[PDB]
Enzyme design. Sequence first.
Site, PDB file in Angstrom:
ATOM      1  CB  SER A  43      -1.031   0.119   1.090  1.00  0.00           C
ATOM      2  OG  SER A  43      -1.840  -0.862   1.032  1.00  0.00           O
ATOM      3  CB  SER A 103      -4.829   1.520   3.670  1.00  0.00           C
ATOM      4  OG  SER A 103      -3.782   1.167   2.487  1.00  0.00           O
ATOM      5  CD  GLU A 139      -3.926  -2.453  -3.885  1.00  0.00           C
ATOM      6  OE1 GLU A 139      -3.866  -3.470  -3.499  1.00  0.00           O
ATOM      7  OE2 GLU A 139      -3.000  -1.343  -3.622  1.00  0.00           O
ATOM      8  CB  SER A 210       0.418  -5.012   5.559  1.00  0.00           C
ATOM      9  OG  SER A 210      -0.756  -4.993   5.405  1.00  0.00           O
TER      10      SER A 210
HETATM   11  C1  LIG Z   1      -1.817  -2.074   1.750  1.00  0.00           C
HETATM   12  O1  LIG Z   1      -0.731  -2.395   1.733  1.00  0.00           O
HETATM   13  N1  LIG Z   1      -2.992  -2.654   1.940  1.00  0.00           N
HETATM   14  C2  LIG Z   1      -4.358  -2.264   1.995  1.00  0.00           C
HETATM   15  C3  LIG Z   1      -4.615  -2.276   3.227  1.00  0.00           C
HETATM   16  N2  LIG Z   1      -3.374  -1.257   3.843  1.00  0.00           N
HETATM   17  O2  LIG Z   1      -3.809  -1.327   5.418  1.00  0.00           O
HETATM   18  S1  LIG Z   1      -2.262  -0.888   5.882  1.00  0.00           S
HETATM   19  O3  LIG Z   1      -1.634   0.290   5.080  1.00  0.00           O
HETATM   20  O4  LIG Z   1      -2.747  -0.415   7.062  1.00  0.00           O
HETATM   21  O5  LIG Z   1      -1.543  -2.002   6.071  1.00  0.00           O
HETATM   22  C4  LIG Z   1      -4.795  -3.565   3.627  1.00  0.00           C
HETATM   23  C5  LIG Z   1      -3.516  -4.416   3.658  1.00  0.00           C
HETATM   24  C6  LIG Z   1      -2.820  -4.152   2.319  1.00  0.00           C
HETATM   25  C7  LIG Z   1      -3.412  -5.001   1.287  1.00  0.00           C
HETATM   26  N3  LIG Z   1      -2.842  -6.285   1.289  1.00  0.00           N
HETATM   27  O6  LIG Z   1      -4.441  -4.874   0.620  1.00  0.00           O
END
Ligand SMILES: *C(=O)N1C[C@H](NOS(=O)(=O)O)CC[C@H]1C(N)=O
EC number: 3.5.2.6
Length: 261
Positions: A43, A103, A139, A210
């Site tokens: 993210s 996010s 995504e 993450s």
């Molecule tokens: C980005 O890494 N994501 C979107 C969302 N992000 O939340 S975080 O930035 O607090 O980790 C959920 C996790 C992740 C994904 N796997 O889509």
Amino acid sequence: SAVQQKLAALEKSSGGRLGVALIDTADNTQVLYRGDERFPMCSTSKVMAAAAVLKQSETQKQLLNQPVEIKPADLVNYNPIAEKHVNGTMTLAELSAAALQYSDNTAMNKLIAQLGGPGGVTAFARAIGDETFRLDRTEPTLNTAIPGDPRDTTTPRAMAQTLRQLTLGHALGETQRAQLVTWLKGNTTGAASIRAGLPTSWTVGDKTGSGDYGTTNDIAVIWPQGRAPLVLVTYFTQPQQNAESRRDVLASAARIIAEGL
Ligand SMILES: *C(=O)N1C[C@H](NOS(=O)(=O)O)CC[C@H]1C(N)=O
């Protein structure tokens, strides 16, 4: 250096692979640990996509207020804002704030689409002098974080340099830089990551990430009390596909960095 000793020991205790890049803008000094290795951005790549739309809005002056349709089929794996607006619209400004501060992955996909696909995000990176960043997928597949896979990766050194240019330099126009900083400062997801390792009096704008392989990331601009800003990237990934997140490792890295100043 002594900070190098401590970062290596933190990495060894964590069991994973840690990447750190600090720029101290007081004197242009740096701290680098695996600073030239690629890491999955997850993210944290949303910063580049939001910045690229901000750059487009410098010449398409009403772009940020254009409505964008949100359909039920657009929802992916984490859509806290977009799910409230299905069968309706959000503007590109709203999608940018949703992507950065909550996010929202559906919002990120709308930014990517506005840019013509993941390659449009990479093209913006190249236009601002980042020759390392690459976005390859939408995504949610950009988060697979497979060891050795270069897709959707950058290095800590490159991402710290780019975050500095975007938030403190002149990669964006004045109003757009300010908007990006405002969005980062309003992030809701960051208190357990870089922020947790820093003095409470310091001001932080950040974007977390993450993914699989226990990937746990944060990229931040930091305004310490009484001194010039810092830019800090902390990327972390682990050997097991199903590994748990380790935001404490990011906080520990930031704490080491803050002690060594
Ligand atoms: C980005 O890494 N994501 C979107 C969302 N992000 O939340 S975080 O930035 O607090 O980790 C959920 C996790 C992740 C994904 N796997 O889509």
